[PDB]
Design a binder for this molecule. Structure first.
Ligand SMILES: [Br-]
Ligand code: NA
Ligand code: NA
Ligand code: NA
Ligand code: NA
Lengths: 244, 238
């Protein structure tokens, strides 16, 4: 199933997000497409209440124990208690703005999965890493740490973020995304199963719009999207329709 | 006003927090006491709906702009939109588990206050800082960073977290130094009106003798805030 995730990031209030959710509830979700929305943490509850059950909800981050002295964090069990079924982990903003290490992200992955959430596990290389020629190394290491903490890939989606194209002056073509997605899909096929490679969705977390979504979705190993800014707009419906 | 804050940290679910809120709604709060509860961030909305208006709600953290590409963060705008009126900033767990720098905490304070939220600004020295004798230096620089980003102390509460642990006298000793720092570096008026609450281990047994200290103006309660004895702590001055 084609996977379309909307990452609202740190945006919206009850009013604007209620309007957005109204637009999404009205949209026909294709039968072959699974749609997930990641609202700001203070609105997970609100969003799950207002969104139609056909759209799943995701938390944007979580910590690695079920309860503890971690002022300002939330646990997978709280996410589940609010009706959310996924959590985004390892987002480039968590890694580079807030310094989340690979080890911490892997431990969060293991805990989210053990508590029965699905996980959208994000990876990607920065500009200087790409230009130094070690896209391979960075992306494989980050995927290794995630895989070390994944026992059932049924509940996991891997999101490649071309961090090197975020505000840097360079952008990623569809072919470049397909290049990296194929190299990742070889890893999974190589280090897990052939069935897991056919099963596991590798989604693209770069810049995607209504105008570009169809060409990118046509790439053989692009199996979905983790959408940023467009996720707050009616244009997100076009990206839901990428495969139609 | 005697200030009693309860930091639930990363604990509770809708059902168990509903029971906790029921016990708090039923308890009668003394005249001259402001009670604030800080739920896990996924339950700010839920907590505000179930708590009687007499109890204010606080977020446990926020970021430093109103909206942006900061997956996993919330802004003071969203805190207000959820009916909360406070945010805890600089808590020892944020600084020492999640490595939040003083600069970032100062920026957070500046933005939260500009947006109309109250701030519970937390400070405190680790045990190695204490054992090296530099307790005063640590909390003085931490407070200085907050003070440089405060334009209205009306809205601010200072919370001293003895991360190192603590007897009531040691607490009052630190609180008195902080009050003196405010008097000398900000203004006499701010030093006299700003409430410095104690954020170390507070229990229904230790609450009254801590509250009686002249510069201990309240508490920011941890574990005990999830238990019935929080009511006793709310009554520490009776
Ligand atoms: Br606390
Ligand atoms: Na990783
Ligand atoms: Na292999
Ligand atoms: Na495809
Ligand atoms: Na007192």
């Amino acid at each position: 199933k084609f996977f379309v995730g909307g990452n609202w990031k740190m945006n919206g209030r009850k009013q604007s997000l209620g309007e957005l959710i109204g637009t999404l509830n009205a949209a026909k979700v294709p039968a072959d497409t699974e749609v997930v929305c990641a609202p700001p943490t203070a609105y997970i509850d609100f969003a799950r209440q207002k969104l139609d059950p056909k759209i799943a909800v995701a938390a944007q981050n979580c910590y690695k124990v079920t309860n503890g002295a971690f002022t300002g964090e939330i646990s997978p069990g709280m996410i589940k208690d609010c009706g959310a079924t996924w959590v985004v982990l390892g987002h480039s903003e968590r890694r580079h703005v807030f310094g989340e290490s690979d080890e911490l992200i892997g431990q969060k992955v293991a805990h989210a999965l053990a508590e029965g959430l699905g996980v959208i596990a994000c990876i990607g290389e920065k500009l200087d890493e790409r230009e130094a020629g070690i896209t391979e190394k960075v992306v494989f290491e980050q995927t290794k740490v995630i895989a070390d903490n994944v026992k059932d890939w049924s509940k996991v989606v891997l999101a490649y973020e071309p961090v090197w194209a975020i505000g840097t002056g360079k952008t990623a073509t569809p072919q470049q995304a397909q290049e990296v997605h194929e190299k990742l899909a070889g890893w999974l096929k190589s280090n897990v199963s052939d069935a897991v490679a056919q099963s596991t969705r590798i989604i693209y977390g770069g810049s995607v719009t209504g105008a570009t979504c169809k060409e990118l979705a046509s790439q053989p190993d692009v199996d979905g999207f983790l959408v940023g800014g467009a996720s707050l707009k009616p244009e997100f419906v076009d990206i839901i329709n990428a495969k139609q």
